[PDB]
Structure formats: C-alpha cells, structure tokens
Structure 1
Amino acid sequence: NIKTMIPGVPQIDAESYILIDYNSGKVLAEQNADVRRDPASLTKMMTSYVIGQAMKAGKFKETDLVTIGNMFLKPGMQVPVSQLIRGINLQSGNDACVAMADFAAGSQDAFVGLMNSYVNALGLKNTHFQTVHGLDADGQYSSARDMALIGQALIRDVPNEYSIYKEKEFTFNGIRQLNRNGLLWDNSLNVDGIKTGHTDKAGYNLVASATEGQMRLISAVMGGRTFKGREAESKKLLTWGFRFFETVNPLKVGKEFASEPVWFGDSDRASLGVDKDVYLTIPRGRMKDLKASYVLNSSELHAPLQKNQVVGTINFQLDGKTIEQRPLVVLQEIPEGNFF
C-alpha cells in the first residue's frame, strides 16, 4: 500500500493556506482556502496584473517616465515605469501603487475598477479590492485560493511582468532596496515568486512559487503568525508538494494516441489525440503504473472528419480508478472519399 497512500499534510502555522500545481490546477493541500481575509500587500499582485496587461497591450513602455503628485517619492519627480513596478513588486511600496494607478487608469477608483474587473474575468468568488496597495479596508477581501489563482494568472498571462518578481534588488535614487521575498535566497528551492504582505488585520501573508524540473507549484499562506514563519511555512508546503507529487505530461498536441477505422473517407484510419496539452499531477513514482484508455462517442467514424473534432473521451487510470478525462479529437482532417 506504499504506492496508493494519501500523504499526511504538515502542520502549517497560519490560518489559511493552499498548494496547487501551476499546469494542472490540482489542489494538493488546503486549509480554509476559501475563507475571506484581508489580503494586505498581496493585493499588489492584482495591481501588478493590471499593469502587466497594459504593457503587454502596448499602452506604455517600461522606459516611460511618470511625474508624481501630490520609496519616498515627491511631487514633480520623474520616475521610469521600470522603477515604480519594481517598487511595487520587490519593495511593496504603497506610494508606487498610487503613482502607477493614476498613470495607468487616471485615478485610483478607475484603477480599482479594473482590478475588480479582472477578478470577475478570472472567476474569483471570494475577492474584492477597495485599494490599489492592499491596506486594510472595510469592503475588500480575498482568500488563499483566489490569491493562488491570481499568482497563476500572473505567470500565465503576463510572464514579462512576472520575471521581475525574482530580482533580488533594485536601486532607486541611489539607494539599494531588497526584494522582501526572502525565499529567493533559499538554496534548497528554486523560488522565483511571488509576493509578500502583512497588516494588523491580515497577519503575515505570502504567495510563493517554485519549480523542480518542469514542475511548478504555487502556495498561498494567509494569516501567518510571524515574519520569519511567513517563509518557513511556505517552504514547508513547497518541499512537501515536491516530495509527494509529480506533474507528468503524457500526451501533447499532435501525438497520435489511438487509431480507429474511418468509413467513406479519403483515408481508412483516423489519428486521434488531444487539442489541448495534458498535464496530470500524480503521487511521485506512480508514472510507471499510469494506464490510459479511451471510449468513443460513436460506433463508427464517418468522413468528413474536421480537424480537432471530438469523437470520444480519454480516461487516465491509476490503480484501476479514473483520475482525469480529456476530449479525444481528430488531429488531421479527413475529407469525403470520392469515386472515379
């Protein structure tokens, strides 16, 4: 029963936490992951997400200058966008958020409206932002799950913005500022994200992400007890996640997974696979025992068969139990067969 066991979770010294796989979205561990808490500076992930989308859209460059009104910024100061986004991500500067909010949306209210528009665009059911920096507000809240998903969106939708989160330091006005994510300096893990935060109502919060090979995990901890424990507890989850789980990529697009006969077509056989790449998070070491089969929606396949046409379902089995399902599609189209 060593292969088919469910691992016990470590005791995490925080009120809420969640651990997910970046590729497959699988939840490996959770505790009060949907309780609505104060997000503190984790809010700045969404602030960074709004900014990342605008630059990705081309609205402003990282070299553009922003004039201040009205990091210790002063009115009339001209600060490159590059420095303000680093003030947000590395330093957690609340003043840099305000500056970038007026610069990106014209006002803080217009910028909070965008933050909450992406909240709905991501489907978050337990998040609402009242601020651009994350200071405690009566009406703003988030949760460990929603914050783990915001971090996923950062990595997925704006990778150029996300690459900043791994920088250990930046210099503003001749003063070196360190990134507050102390896990970047950990020799045992490969941590390149994401964001720390803390307030009186929120406690000590950390959204972290690490990689081991091509596997990527995202942890979110909220309501942490101490400043140091913030990083220690997140390190507990990530190492635990990598020790007991492995992400595997069994089938990618274009790879033939099965062949079935085709009637009335230009060809006699169809090449069946998947249109979206498959990522499965399984107990580490059980990839050798992973079995895959499939069912068909029809007794026969009739031409014409369009490209990426659904014809059945793939079933991935581990220990005789289906763990994931994906649509089985036609890879190459097959037009109607003609007769001379």
Structure 2
Amino acid sequence: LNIKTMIPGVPQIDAESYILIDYNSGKVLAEQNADVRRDPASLTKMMTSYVIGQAMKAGKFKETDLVTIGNDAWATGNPVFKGSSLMFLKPGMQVPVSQLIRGINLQSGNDACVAMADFAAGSQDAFVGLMNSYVNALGLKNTHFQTVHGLDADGQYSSARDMALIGQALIRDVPNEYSIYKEKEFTFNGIRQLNRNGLLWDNSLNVDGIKTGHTDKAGYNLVASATEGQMRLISAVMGGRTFKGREAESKKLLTWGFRFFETVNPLKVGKEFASEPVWFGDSDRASLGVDKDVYLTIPRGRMKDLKASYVLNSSELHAPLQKNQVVGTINFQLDGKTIEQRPLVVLQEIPEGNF
C-alpha cells in the first residue's frame, strides 16, 4: 500500500516560477508561483504564432504568399530592436510567410513579428487586439499583451500557468503551426539560422517545442513540450536564474513527470459507457457516454487499479432526450476515492415515441 499510494517529492527548480501540466488531461503535476505575473519576454511570440496559426487555419493566407516588408519591420531602421533577436528584414523585401514564421518560431525575430502583424491584421495595435482577444477566449487570468514581439511593453505580463496554457492551445488548435517548432534550422538570405530551443537536440527526451526567452529583466524563460508513448507534457519555467539551468531545469521537470505519472484514455466520444431505461421514447434504452474524449493523469503504474462508475442526476430518464444532454456524472476512482469526474451524456438522440 505504501509504495502504491506514494506521493513523489518534487525536484527543486532554480527559477522564480514553474508549472508542469499534462497536455491531454490538463492535470497540473507540479507548480510553484504559477500565477505570479511576470515579464514574458519572447514567450509573447507564442501568442503571435497562435494568432498567425488561426489566420492560416481560416485560409486568410498561406505559407507561399509573399509579404512585402515595410519600414516598421526594418531591423536596422528602428532602434527599439537594438540588441534583440532579428531576421534582418529591409523594406521592399518580398518574403514568403513560411520564412517569416520560421523567423518568428525558430529565431524569435522581432522584425518578423512586425512584418506578420501588419500582413495579418493591418497594424501592430490591431494584431495585439487579436492576441488579447485570444487571451480572453482561452480564459487566461494573468496575461496581457501590449506588443507583437515582447519589446517596449511596460504593462505586458503573463504567468507560468498561462504560458503553459498557450502552449497547450498551440498544439491543440493550430497543429500545423505547432509542427514548425521542432525544426532545428532554416535558411534566410543565404544564412543558416538555428532554433534557439537547445532541448530539441537532447537525445534523452523527445522535445518538439516550444519557445525560449531571455531579457535581463525577465531572466531565462522556456516553455517546453515533450512526449513519451501516449503521453505529452508541457513545462513552463519563468525567471530561470542561471545560464547553466536554462534547459536543465525544464529537463528536470519533464523527466520527473514521465517517471512518476502516466496518462490514460479510458473513454472516447460516442462510445457507450452505460445504458439506462428511458420512458416515452422511440427506444427502450438510452446509450450514455461522453461528448469529449476522457484523459486522466494518474500515478505511473496505477492504470490497472483505475475503477469507473456513475451517478444519475434524475431518478428516471424521460424522452425526448437530446444528443449530448447531460444526465449524470462519471466517477473515476483509485483506492476507493474519486480522483476525476466527467459529465455523462446521451450519445444518440431519443425523441418521443411515434407509432
């Protein structure tokens, strides 16, 4: 019992805040100061990429389309860019979207962000409006953007939790955009540029994202995501305190998560979990399940011990029953205790009887 019910100790993490979540279940595996508002620095570009990804998903433009660079995206024409990561765009260049988005995602090019913001939304301010609209849509409680890149934004902030949630949204909602993050290099204007995410080259993990950020003000920041088998984790580490820990602290969290936790998928949408009699219907019985795939994160090795059962909201089911009508709750249990609950819904509509 003692070894089965063990709660693992969390490694010490040399950073101001962090969080470790499961991508599929959303379970928070470990956290410290995860809601404290901090300078996001280049992590802001995750939201820039999310907006671009949404626009591309919507067919607003495609990767082959040429963007004509304007004055505001001219790297050496705007001292706000001094000492920052740049693609080195000049006005009059005609650059494919594919190249600009790799400038953003791999190189953290601040100039590329401006070029894409104007192309996608007409102005930087309108683009930032979109970024903040998605902050609202994603339910983020501790995030606000002022810039398309992270620079020159005194009232901009995010948090470890919110940055992990933006990472989750990238992978979930804009998978074609997310797929770019694992690319180790791209070439622009005859120069090869390497992805800044050093973890991509760590053989011991399968890291395929997401974004790094450093300013002297924000410290060292990293949102990472890695997979092992069925399982995908996302870590966000903000205000990393040393150069030597910039990838090491995140690696500590990810490796710890895979060692102690596992993700299970006990039920898919549309598959019967339970059946109940129904009154007044065109069928004698209601087929019951979920309207969203169930993922649970549990201690590693406890999968065989997982039990499921359900409760019903009402004594009797009466037709008409709508598809996806909520009629109860599924309880998932370990060691006799409910650890997770999901809504139990009608899978196939049952109208009133017609004879």
**TM-score category (smaller protein):** over 0.9
Query: How many Å apart are 1:261 and its aligned residue?
Result: 2.2
Q: Distance in 2 between matches of 1:93 and 1:153?
A: 22
Q: Distance in 2 between matches of 1:306 and 1:131?
A: 45
Query: How many Å apart are 1:301 and its aligned residue?
Result: 2.3
Instruction: Tell me if structure 2 keeps the 8 A contact 1:38–1:141.
Output: yes
- TM-score scaled by structure 1? 0.96
Instruction: Tell me if structure 2 keeps the 8 A contact 1:136–1:201.
Output: no
Q: Deviations over 1:64-102 (max 9, x none)?
A: 1112222x1112111111111100100111111111112
Q: Name the residue aligned to 1:118.
A: 134
Instruction: Tell me if structure 2 keeps the 8 A contact 1:314–1:328.
Output: yes
Q: Distance in 1 between matches of 2:139 and 2:349?
A: 34
Structure 2: gaps (5+ residues): 72-87
Q: Distance in 2 between matches of 1:258 and 1:129?
A: 46
Q: Deviations over 1:283-302 (max 9, x none)?
A: 11111111111111222223
Instruction: Tell me if structure 2 keeps the 8 A contact 1:310–1:327.
Output: yes
Query: How many Å apart are 1:136 and its aligned residue?
Result: 5.4
Instruction: Tell me if structure 2 keeps the 8 A contact 1:136–1:199.
Output: no
Q: Distance in 2 between matches of 1:147 and 1:281?
A: 20
CA 1:264–1:118 in 2, change beyond 3 Å: closer, same or farther? closer
Query: How many Å apart are 1:245 and its aligned residue?
Result: 0.7
- TM-score scaled by structure 2? 0.92
Residue 157 (structure 1) aligned with residue 173 (structure 2) = yes
Residue 272 (structure 1) aligned with residue 288 (structure 2) = yes
Q: Deviations over 1:306-333 (max 9, x none)?
A: 3222221111111111111111122223
Residue 315 (structure 1) aligned with residue 331 (structure 2) = yes
Q: Distance in 1 between matches of 2:321 and 2:7?
A: 43
**Stretch deviating more after TM superposition (110-119 or 182-191):** 110-119
Residue 306 (structure 1) aligned with residue 322 (structure 2) = yes
CA 1:139–1:294 in 2, change beyond 3 Å: closer, same or farther? same
Query: How many Å apart are 1:268 and its aligned residue?
Result: 2.6
CA 1:303–1:129 in 2, change beyond 3 Å: closer, same or farther? closer
From 206, 216, 220, the counterpart of 1:190: 206
Q: Deviations over 1:110-148 (max 9, x none)?
A: 222221121112111111112111125311111101100
Query: How many Å apart are 1:269 and its aligned residue?
Result: 2.6
Structure 1: gaps (5+ residues): none
Q: Distance in 2 between matches of 1:210 and 1:155?
A: 11
Instruction: Tell me if structure 2 keeps the 8 A contact 1:68–1:74.
Output: yes
Instruction: Tell me if structure 2 keeps the 8 A contact 1:40–1:136.
Output: no
Task: Give the aligned length.
Answer: 338
**Stretch deviating more after TM superposition (54-63 or 293-302):** 293-302
The RMSD of aligned alpha carbons is 1.4
CA 1:250–1:172 in 2, change beyond 3 Å: closer, same or farther? same
Secondary structure at the aligned position of 2:304 is classed as coil
Q: Distance in 1 between matches of 2:315 and 2:121?
A: 56
